[PDB]
């Protein structure tokens, strides 16, 4: 999980 900033 490398989710970008929203």
């Amino acid at each position, epitope marked *: 999980d490398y989710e*970008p*900033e*929203a």
Partner: nanobody
Amino acid sequence: GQLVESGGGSVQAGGSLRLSCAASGIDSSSYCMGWFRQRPGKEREGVARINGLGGVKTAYADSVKDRFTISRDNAENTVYLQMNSLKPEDTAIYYCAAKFSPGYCGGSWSNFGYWGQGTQVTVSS
């Protein structure tokens, strides 16, 4: 694609209100979902947004940071706005919205495509 807000009402300064946004047609767990508001006599502005693709990261307008929390319950296909520490300045019609396609928000309020009819939030002193 339809979004329906509820949970609005008329509360007192310092209090809280929890708004809900029920999605239909689309699967909100997949989409960048947002809350916007239109304060009396002002243009619509972003309030909070949460990533799609099952993401959990969020962003907020400076005016509401630390007071409001957006979240999504994927099992209910519903997005929430938990509004704490309400101020009369938060009085507005609040709208739920989604970007056009599954994905991440990309750091902006642009390109929101589906919109609810809105729910009134009044905060009095």
